[PDB]
Structures are given as C-alpha cells and as structure tokens.
Short mmCIF file of N, CA and C and ligand atoms in Angstrom, two decimals:
data_model
loop_
_atom_site.label_atom_id
_atom_site.label_comp_id
_atom_site.label_asym_id
_atom_site.label_seq_id
_atom_site.Cartn_x
_atom_site.Cartn_y
_atom_site.Cartn_z
N UNK W 1 -43.45 -156.97 80.78
CA UNK W 1 -41.69 -156.16 80.58
C UNK W 1 -42.07 -154.72 81.38
N UNK W 2 -41.01 -154.63 81.78
CA UNK W 2 -40.89 -152.99 81.69
C UNK W 2 -39.33 -152.92 81.45
N UNK W 3 -38.86 -151.56 82.00
CA UNK W 3 -37.19 -151.27 81.93
C UNK W 3 -36.67 -150.38 82.38
N UNK W 4 -35.75 -150.65 83.26
CA UNK W 4 -35.66 -149.02 83.87
C UNK W 4 -34.12 -149.22 83.79
N UNK W 5 -33.79 -147.64 84.07
CA UNK W 5 -32.33 -146.91 84.88
C UNK W 5 -31.66 -146.97 86.29
N UNK W 6 -31.21 -147.93 86.38
CA UNK W 6 -30.84 -147.96 87.92
C UNK W 6 -28.84 -147.85 88.38
N UNK W 7 -29.79 -146.87 89.42
CA UNK W 7 -27.99 -146.53 89.77
C UNK W 7 -27.69 -146.28 91.54
N UNK W 8 -26.35 -146.87 91.65
CA UNK W 8 -26.29 -146.69 92.84
C UNK W 8 -25.48 -145.07 93.14
N UNK W 9 -25.59 -153.44 98.54
CA UNK W 9 -26.02 -151.97 98.71
C UNK W 9 -27.73 -152.12 97.60
N UNK W 10 -28.14 -150.38 98.20
CA UNK W 10 -29.04 -150.79 97.25
C UNK W 10 -29.30 -149.92 96.12
N UNK W 11 -30.55 -149.87 94.67
CA UNK W 11 -30.04 -149.62 93.23
C UNK W 11 -31.23 -148.20 93.70
N UNK W 12 -30.52 -146.83 93.15
CA UNK W 12 -32.76 -146.12 92.75
C UNK W 12 -32.76 -145.91 91.39
N UNK W 13 -34.13 -146.19 91.10
CA UNK W 13 -34.49 -146.43 89.49
C UNK W 13 -35.71 -145.53 88.83
N UNK W 14 -35.19 -145.11 87.93
CA UNK W 14 -36.49 -144.72 87.32
C UNK W 14 -36.82 -145.09 85.95
N UNK W 15 -38.06 -144.83 84.97
CA UNK W 15 -38.14 -145.50 83.61
C UNK W 15 -36.94 -144.39 83.43
N UNK W 16 -36.73 -146.10 81.63
CA UNK W 16 -35.08 -145.81 81.30
C UNK W 16 -34.42 -144.28 80.54
N UNK W 17 -35.65 -143.88 79.86
CA UNK W 17 -35.70 -142.40 79.49
C UNK W 17 -35.89 -141.38 80.99
N UNK W 18 -35.97 -141.18 81.90
CA UNK W 18 -36.55 -140.00 82.46
C UNK W 18 -35.18 -140.02 83.48
N UNK W 19 -35.12 -138.46 83.33
CA UNK W 19 -33.83 -138.17 84.29
C UNK W 19 -33.59 -138.39 85.84
N UNK W 20 -33.05 -138.72 86.81
CA UNK W 20 -32.38 -139.18 87.81
C UNK W 20 -32.01 -138.31 88.49
N UNK W 21 -32.97 -138.01 89.91
CA UNK W 21 -32.20 -137.34 91.04
C UNK W 21 -32.31 -137.68 92.36
N UNK W 22 -31.78 -137.72 93.18
CA UNK W 22 -32.01 -138.22 95.01
C UNK W 22 -33.52 -139.03 94.83
N UNK W 23 -33.37 -140.08 94.34
CA UNK W 23 -34.62 -141.20 94.41
C UNK W 23 -35.69 -140.53 93.58
N UNK W 24 -35.74 -139.57 92.72
CA UNK W 24 -36.50 -139.33 92.29
C UNK W 24 -36.66 -138.92 90.87
N UNK W 25 -37.82 -138.94 89.98
CA UNK W 25 -37.37 -139.51 88.36
C UNK W 25 -38.49 -138.06 87.46
N UNK W 26 -37.46 -137.42 87.32
CA UNK W 26 -38.11 -136.08 85.86
C UNK W 26 -38.18 -135.96 84.96
N UNK W 27 -39.38 -135.63 83.62
CA UNK W 27 -39.58 -135.19 82.31
C UNK W 27 -39.76 -134.23 82.40
N UNK W 28 -39.25 -133.05 81.71
CA UNK W 28 -39.90 -131.98 80.80
C UNK W 28 -40.31 -132.10 79.46
N UNK W 29 -41.67 -131.24 79.37
CA UNK W 29 -42.15 -131.54 78.07
C UNK W 29 -42.78 -130.44 77.69
N UNK W 30 -42.31 -130.00 76.38
CA UNK W 30 -42.20 -128.73 75.25
C UNK W 30 -43.59 -128.13 75.16
N UNK W 31 -44.57 -129.49 74.50
CA UNK W 31 -45.56 -129.45 74.24
C UNK W 31 -46.77 -128.31 74.74
N UNK W 32 -47.41 -127.28 75.15
CA UNK W 32 -48.10 -126.10 75.56
C UNK W 32 -48.88 -126.93 75.84
N UNK W 33 -49.61 -126.34 76.73
CA UNK W 33 -49.94 -126.88 77.31
C UNK W 33 -51.31 -125.72 78.78
N UNK W 34 -52.57 -126.09 79.91
CA UNK W 34 -52.55 -125.16 80.43
C UNK W 34 -52.04 -126.31 81.56
N UNK W 35 -52.66 -125.24 83.06
CA UNK W 35 -51.54 -125.97 84.34
C UNK W 35 -52.96 -127.02 84.14
N UNK W 36 -54.02 -126.90 84.39
CA UNK W 36 -54.54 -128.51 84.71
C UNK W 36 -54.94 -129.21 83.70
N UNK W 37 -54.16 -129.09 81.78
CA UNK W 37 -54.16 -129.91 80.99
C UNK W 37 -53.01 -130.62 81.29
N UNK W 38 -52.00 -129.70 81.96
CA UNK W 38 -50.37 -129.96 82.52
C UNK W 38 -50.63 -131.48 83.72
N UNK W 39 -51.12 -131.08 84.41
CA UNK W 39 -50.81 -131.89 85.52
C UNK W 39 -51.63 -133.19 85.02
N UNK W 40 -53.27 -132.44 83.64
CA UNK W 40 -53.62 -134.20 83.96
C UNK W 40 -52.61 -135.34 83.22
N UNK W 41 -51.45 -134.70 81.96
CA UNK W 41 -50.70 -135.34 81.21
C UNK W 41 -49.53 -136.32 81.89
N UNK W 42 -49.16 -135.59 83.42
CA UNK W 42 -48.46 -135.68 84.21
C UNK W 42 -48.50 -137.13 84.56
N UNK W 43 -50.20 -136.96 85.19
CA UNK W 43 -50.83 -137.73 86.27
C UNK W 43 -51.12 -139.64 85.33
N UNK W 44 -51.44 -138.86 83.83
CA UNK W 44 -51.75 -140.20 82.98
C UNK W 44 -50.58 -141.40 82.91
N UNK W 45 -49.08 -140.73 83.57
CA UNK W 45 -48.08 -141.64 83.27
C UNK W 45 -47.66 -141.74 84.66
N UNK W 46 -48.60 -141.40 85.78
CA UNK W 46 -48.23 -141.97 87.46
C UNK W 46 -47.91 -140.98 87.94
N UNK W 47 -47.54 -139.41 87.25
CA UNK W 47 -46.63 -138.78 87.76
C UNK W 47 -47.36 -137.54 88.48
N UNK W 48 -46.46 -136.62 89.05
CA UNK W 48 -47.29 -135.23 89.29
C UNK W 48 -46.50 -133.88 88.60
N UNK W 49 -46.85 -132.74 89.23
CA UNK W 49 -46.35 -131.74 88.06
C UNK W 49 -44.72 -131.71 89.11
N UNK W 50 -44.13 -130.88 88.95
CA UNK W 50 -42.75 -130.71 89.83
C UNK W 50 -43.42 -130.21 91.14
N UNK W 51 -43.27 -131.07 92.59
CA UNK W 51 -43.24 -130.54 93.21
C UNK W 51 -41.27 -129.80 93.67
N UNK W 52 -41.05 -128.82 93.92
CA UNK W 52 -39.75 -128.45 93.83
C UNK W 52 -39.58 -127.85 96.41
N UNK W 53 -38.64 -128.56 96.39
CA UNK W 53 -38.17 -128.69 97.64
C UNK W 53 -36.80 -128.28 98.34
N UNK W 54 -36.41 -127.92 96.92
CA UNK W 54 -34.64 -128.07 98.10
C UNK W 54 -33.77 -126.94 96.48
N UNK W 55 -33.34 -125.86 96.49
CA UNK W 55 -32.90 -125.67 95.21
C UNK W 55 -31.48 -126.38 94.66
N UNK W 56 -30.87 -127.71 95.37
CA UNK W 56 -30.49 -128.46 94.92
C UNK W 56 -31.52 -129.30 94.00
N UNK W 57 -32.62 -129.79 93.87
CA UNK W 57 -33.46 -130.40 93.26
C UNK W 57 -33.68 -128.95 91.91
N UNK W 58 -34.13 -127.98 92.16
CA UNK W 58 -33.36 -127.14 90.70
C UNK W 58 -33.19 -126.66 90.20
N UNK W 59 -31.64 -127.07 90.81
CA UNK W 59 -30.69 -126.98 89.99
C UNK W 59 -30.57 -128.14 88.77
N UNK W 60 -30.28 -128.91 89.48
CA UNK W 60 -30.00 -130.75 88.63
C UNK W 60 -31.23 -129.90 87.72
N UNK W 61 -32.93 -129.95 87.46
CA UNK W 61 -34.07 -130.01 87.55
C UNK W 61 -33.42 -128.71 85.86
N UNK W 62 -33.28 -127.82 86.05
CA UNK W 62 -33.01 -126.56 84.96
C UNK W 62 -31.67 -126.44 83.76
N UNK W 63 -30.76 -127.47 83.84
CA UNK W 63 -30.07 -127.68 83.29
C UNK W 63 -30.46 -128.28 82.06
N UNK W 64 -31.64 -129.27 81.87
CA UNK W 64 -32.72 -129.04 81.02
C UNK W 64 -33.23 -129.40 80.07
N UNK W 65 -33.13 -127.45 80.89
CA UNK W 65 -34.85 -126.98 79.96
C UNK W 65 -34.19 -125.60 79.32
N UNK W 66 -35.12 -125.26 78.01
CA UNK W 66 -34.93 -124.20 76.97
C UNK W 66 -35.53 -123.14 77.74
N UNK W 67 -34.23 -122.19 77.79
CA UNK W 67 -34.04 -120.42 78.46
C UNK W 67 -35.30 -119.60 78.14
N UNK W 68 -35.56 -120.28 76.26
CA UNK W 68 -36.45 -119.63 75.79
C UNK W 68 -38.41 -119.78 76.30
N UNK W 69 -38.81 -121.27 77.44
CA UNK W 69 -39.66 -121.50 77.60
C UNK W 69 -39.82 -121.37 79.21
N UNK W 70 -41.63 -121.28 80.02
CA UNK W 70 -41.88 -121.59 80.74
C UNK W 70 -42.46 -123.01 81.37
N UNK W 71 -42.08 -123.20 82.02
CA UNK W 71 -42.09 -124.28 82.54
C UNK W 71 -43.15 -124.94 83.81
N UNK W 72 -44.40 -125.25 84.06
CA UNK W 72 -45.20 -125.06 85.14
C UNK W 72 -44.51 -126.19 86.11
N UNK W 73 -44.56 -125.59 87.42
CA UNK W 73 -44.43 -126.67 88.14
C UNK W 73 -45.82 -126.85 89.35
N UNK W 74 -45.74 -127.98 90.01
CA UNK W 74 -46.50 -128.37 90.15
C UNK W 74 -47.90 -127.34 91.87
N UNK W 75 -47.67 -126.05 91.58
CA UNK W 75 -47.74 -124.89 92.29
C UNK W 75 -48.51 -123.86 92.46
N UNK W 76 -49.83 -124.12 92.88
CA UNK W 76 -51.15 -123.87 92.53
C UNK W 76 -51.87 -122.77 93.84
N UNK W 77 -52.18 -122.05 93.92
CA UNK W 77 -52.73 -120.69 94.75
C UNK W 77 -54.26 -120.58 93.88
N UNK W 78 -55.18 -121.51 94.40
CA UNK W 78 -56.66 -121.30 93.11
C UNK W 78 -57.73 -119.96 94.09
N UNK W 79 -57.27 -118.91 95.21
CA UNK W 79 -58.39 -117.91 94.71
C UNK W 79 -57.16 -116.45 95.24
N UNK W 80 -56.14 -116.67 94.71
CA UNK W 80 -55.06 -115.59 95.61
C UNK W 80 -54.66 -115.07 96.71
N UNK W 81 -55.47 -115.74 97.60
CA UNK W 81 -54.91 -115.40 99.21
C UNK W 81 -53.08 -115.87 99.30
N UNK W 82 -52.89 -116.25 98.65
CA UNK W 82 -51.55 -117.26 98.68
C UNK W 82 -51.74 -118.63 100.16
N UNK W 83 -52.71 -118.82 99.39
CA UNK W 83 -52.90 -120.00 100.08
C UNK W 83 -52.05 -121.29 99.36
N UNK W 84 -50.71 -121.10 99.10
CA UNK W 84 -50.46 -121.71 97.88
C UNK W 84 -49.44 -123.46 98.07
N UNK W 85 -50.46 -124.38 97.17
CA UNK W 85 -50.60 -125.45 97.69
C UNK W 85 -49.68 -126.50 96.26
N UNK W 86 -48.80 -127.93 96.52
CA UNK W 86 -48.18 -128.64 95.64
C UNK W 86 -49.40 -129.45 95.24
N UNK W 87 -49.39 -129.68 94.28
CA UNK W 87 -50.49 -130.44 93.60
C UNK W 87 -50.27 -132.17 93.91
N UNK W 88 -49.00 -132.04 94.24
CA UNK W 88 -48.51 -133.41 95.07
C UNK W 88 -48.83 -133.98 96.36
N UNK W 89 -49.19 -133.32 97.02
CA UNK W 89 -49.46 -132.90 98.68
C UNK W 89 -48.66 -132.82 99.03
N UNK W 90 -46.71 -132.35 98.38
CA UNK W 90 -46.10 -132.55 99.63
C UNK W 90 -46.27 -130.69 99.46
N UNK W 91 -46.23 -131.10 101.47
CA UNK W 91 -46.73 -129.88 102.40
C UNK W 91 -45.93 -128.27 102.00
N UNK W 92 -46.77 -127.26 101.43
CA UNK W 92 -45.96 -125.72 101.33
C UNK W 92 -44.59 -125.29 102.52
N UNK W 93 -43.88 -125.40 101.96
CA UNK W 93 -42.92 -124.76 102.69
C UNK W 93 -42.36 -123.60 102.69
N UNK W 94 -42.97 -122.07 102.67
CA UNK W 94 -43.00 -120.69 102.44
C UNK W 94 -41.68 -120.11 102.58
N UNK W 95 -40.67 -121.39 103.31
CA UNK W 95 -39.16 -120.70 104.04
C UNK W 95 -38.47 -121.45 103.09
N UNK W 96 -38.64 -121.70 101.76
CA UNK W 96 -38.16 -122.02 100.59
C UNK W 96 -38.70 -122.57 99.57
N UNK W 97 -39.08 -121.07 98.87
CA UNK W 97 -39.05 -120.69 97.41
C UNK W 97 -38.12 -119.95 96.66
N UNK W 98 -38.76 -119.84 95.83
CA UNK W 98 -37.88 -119.51 94.84
C UNK W 98 -37.98 -118.49 93.89
N UNK W 99 -39.18 -117.21 94.25
CA UNK W 99 -39.21 -116.32 93.87
C UNK W 99 -38.20 -115.52 92.95
N UNK W 100 -38.65 -115.28 91.40
CA UNK W 100 -38.17 -113.50 90.76
C UNK W 100 -38.22 -112.61 92.05
N UNK W 101 -37.38 -111.75 91.55
CA UNK W 101 -37.30 -110.69 91.58
C UNK W 101 -38.72 -110.21 91.36
N UNK W 102 -39.37 -109.06 92.48
CA UNK W 102 -41.01 -108.55 92.85
C UNK W 102 -42.21 -109.51 91.74
N UNK W 103 -41.82 -110.93 92.37
CA UNK W 103 -42.83 -112.27 92.51
C UNK W 103 -42.91 -112.47 93.43
N UNK W 104 -44.09 -112.98 94.14
CA UNK W 104 -44.99 -113.34 92.72
C UNK W 104 -45.72 -112.07 93.07
N UNK W 105 -46.83 -111.81 91.71
CA UNK W 105 -47.25 -110.44 91.75
C UNK W 105 -48.77 -110.33 91.31
N UNK W 106 -49.34 -111.21 91.05
CA UNK W 106 -50.95 -111.34 90.63
C UNK W 106 -51.94 -111.41 92.52
N UNK W 107 -52.67 -110.46 91.84
CA UNK W 107 -53.35 -110.14 93.83
C UNK W 107 -54.72 -110.96 93.05
N UNK W 108 -55.40 -111.70 92.18
CA UNK W 108 -56.24 -112.10 91.66
C UNK W 108 -56.22 -112.96 90.96
N UNK W 109 -57.90 -114.08 90.74
CA UNK W 109 -57.77 -115.11 89.62
C UNK W 109 -56.89 -116.72 91.01
N UNK W 110 -56.64 -117.48 90.06
CA UNK W 110 -56.45 -118.85 90.04
C UNK W 110 -54.92 -118.70 89.48
N UNK W 111 -53.92 -118.58 90.40
CA UNK W 111 -52.94 -118.31 89.88
C UNK W 111 -51.56 -119.58 90.45
N UNK W 112 -50.99 -119.75 89.30
CA UNK W 112 -50.09 -120.73 89.58
C UNK W 112 -48.28 -120.77 88.87
N UNK W 113 -47.62 -121.76 89.20
CA UNK W 113 -46.17 -121.07 89.08
C UNK W 113 -45.24 -121.61 87.56
N UNK W 114 -44.48 -120.89 87.20
CA UNK W 114 -43.89 -121.48 86.30
C UNK W 114 -42.01 -121.27 86.68
N UNK W 115 -41.56 -122.33 86.26
CA UNK W 115 -39.58 -122.06 85.88
C UNK W 115 -39.45 -121.05 85.06
N UNK W 116 -38.99 -119.85 85.05
CA UNK W 116 -38.96 -119.11 83.78
C UNK W 116 -37.32 -118.58 83.76
N UNK W 117 -36.67 -118.33 82.52
CA UNK W 117 -35.59 -118.02 82.88
C UNK W 117 -35.76 -117.01 82.44
N UNK W 118 -35.31 -115.42 83.71
CA UNK W 118 -35.38 -114.14 83.26
C UNK W 118 -34.22 -113.56 84.35
N UNK W 119 -33.74 -112.69 83.74
CA UNK W 119 -32.63 -111.63 83.87
C UNK W 119 -31.45 -112.30 84.51
N UNK W 120 -31.43 -113.88 83.18
CA UNK W 120 -30.26 -114.26 83.16
C UNK W 120 -29.59 -115.29 84.87
N UNK W 121 -31.27 -116.02 85.17
CA UNK W 121 -31.27 -116.71 86.15
C UNK W 121 -32.96 -117.20 86.19
N UNK W 122 -32.75 -118.96 86.46
CA UNK W 122 -34.11 -119.35 86.54
C UNK W 122 -34.82 -119.73 88.00
N UNK W 123 -35.98 -119.26 87.78
CA UNK W 123 -36.29 -118.77 88.68
C UNK W 123 -38.24 -118.76 89.12
N UNK W 124 -38.60 -118.47 90.33
CA UNK W 124 -39.96 -118.96 89.52
C UNK W 124 -41.57 -117.44 89.44
N UNK W 125 -42.32 -117.78 88.40
CA UNK W 125 -43.38 -116.82 88.28
C UNK W 125 -44.04 -117.50 88.86
N UNK W 126 -45.71 -116.28 88.85
CA UNK W 126 -46.70 -116.38 89.22
C UNK W 126 -47.64 -116.45 87.97
N UNK W 127 -48.27 -116.58 87.47
CA UNK W 127 -48.55 -117.01 85.71
C UNK W 127 -50.24 -117.29 86.14
N UNK W 128 -51.40 -116.80 85.62
CA UNK W 128 -52.69 -117.61 85.81
C UNK W 128 -53.17 -119.17 85.21
N UNK W 129 -53.71 -119.37 85.87
CA UNK W 129 -53.35 -121.11 85.26
C UNK W 129 -54.02 -121.54 84.35
N UNK W 130 -55.12 -120.51 83.90
CA UNK W 130 -55.24 -121.02 81.88
C UNK W 130 -54.50 -121.02 81.12
N UNK W 131 -53.00 -120.12 81.13
CA UNK W 131 -52.10 -119.57 80.67
C UNK W 131 -51.12 -121.60 79.73
N UNK W 132 -50.89 -121.24 78.69
CA UNK W 132 -50.05 -122.35 78.55
C UNK W 132 -48.66 -122.32 77.77
N UNK W 133 -48.27 -122.93 78.61
CA UNK W 133 -46.97 -123.58 78.99
C UNK W 133 -46.00 -124.85 78.54
N UNK W 134 -45.05 -125.22 78.61
CA UNK W 134 -44.03 -126.47 79.01
C UNK W 134 -44.74 -126.48 80.70
N UNK W 135 -44.02 -127.85 81.12
CA UNK W 135 -43.95 -128.83 82.39
C UNK W 135 -43.19 -129.68 82.31
N UNK W 136 -42.65 -129.83 83.48
CA UNK W 136 -42.04 -130.76 84.67
C UNK W 136 -42.81 -131.86 85.03
N UNK W 137 -43.12 -133.04 84.44
CA UNK W 137 -43.65 -133.90 85.04
C UNK W 137 -42.28 -134.91 86.57
N UNK W 138 -42.87 -135.79 87.35
CA UNK W 138 -42.25 -136.16 88.34
C UNK W 138 -42.90 -137.28 89.18
N UNK W 139 -41.95 -137.94 88.84
CA UNK W 139 -42.59 -139.63 89.82
C UNK W 139 -41.27 -140.03 90.93
N UNK W 140 -42.67 -141.07 92.32
CA UNK W 140 -41.07 -140.94 92.94
C UNK W 140 -40.01 -142.36 92.15
N UNK W 141 -39.06 -142.08 92.66
CA UNK W 141 -37.84 -143.44 91.94
C UNK W 141 -38.63 -144.55 92.50
N UNK W 142 -38.14 -145.94 92.41
CA UNK W 142 -38.40 -147.16 92.20
C UNK W 142 -36.94 -147.41 92.92
N UNK W 143 -37.25 -148.62 93.77
CA UNK W 143 -35.91 -149.36 94.76
C UNK W 143 -35.88 -151.05 94.51
N UNK W 144 -34.82 -151.39 94.63
CA UNK W 144 -34.24 -152.24 94.36
C UNK W 144 -32.12 -152.24 94.85
N UNK W 145 -32.25 -153.91 95.56
CA UNK W 145 -32.40 -155.02 95.60
C UNK W 145 -32.90 -155.42 96.85
CA1 LIG Z 201 -46.37 -113.26 87.76
#
C-alpha cells in the first residue's frame, strides 16, 4: 500500500501529504537540526534538502514557511572557497542566486544556506553548517499514467 496525491493526459503525483509544484514534492520541517542531520533526515524519506533553481520555486515554498524560523536548503560550501554545491547534485548555477543584501558574508569555515525572513523579504543567508535550524525536504514527483 502507498497513497498519492495526483494533479494534472499525464498526472503528476506526490506522496499524499507533501506540497506539490512543477513535478516536485516538498515538506518544510520545524524541529531544529544541524545541516548534516537535516540532510540525514531528508534522505531517510528518499528526499534531499531543497534545491532552489528558479524564483518561481522559491515563491512557491515560502508561502508555507514560518517567518520566525530559518530553513536549511541543500546548498553548501565546505571550505569557504565559494565552491557552493547542491547536495542533491543539481549543478550550481551562480546566475540564479537569491542572497539577502550583504550576503553571503562568512569568509571562513564550513558554510550552508538557510531561507530566512529579514527586511520584509524571504532570501538566502549563509550560516555555519553546525548551526541548528529547520529544513525543507524535496523529492522528485512520480508520473502516471
Ligand atoms: Ca551570513
């Protein structure tokens, strides 16, 4: 037994309780974890920390986020070289970033990114990967029929 929510021909499906947008399924989670613990939790559901490729994708997810919290995305720079990599292995596209003003601003250590609300706006902030925050898991949708 499994249970899907399918929307359109072809039908795009997600697990019943996940949020659906353009062939992908998302779930924001609010219990605090480090970046690596967060990714561990996502992968346990077949998922990964969310990759954000378009503004449309970000605009979709932010409507389900608590403005008091930071949410880990999948983007990580392990040695502070500016070698940002998506943990889901989507190739990093530096012409499609969404930093807050004056970010990224950590010049040392292992840095990760959170979606955070600041200055009346959702955008990216770089944060030490050992910081504890919420997260957004993302899993590719399935297709029928
Ligand atoms: Ca920062």
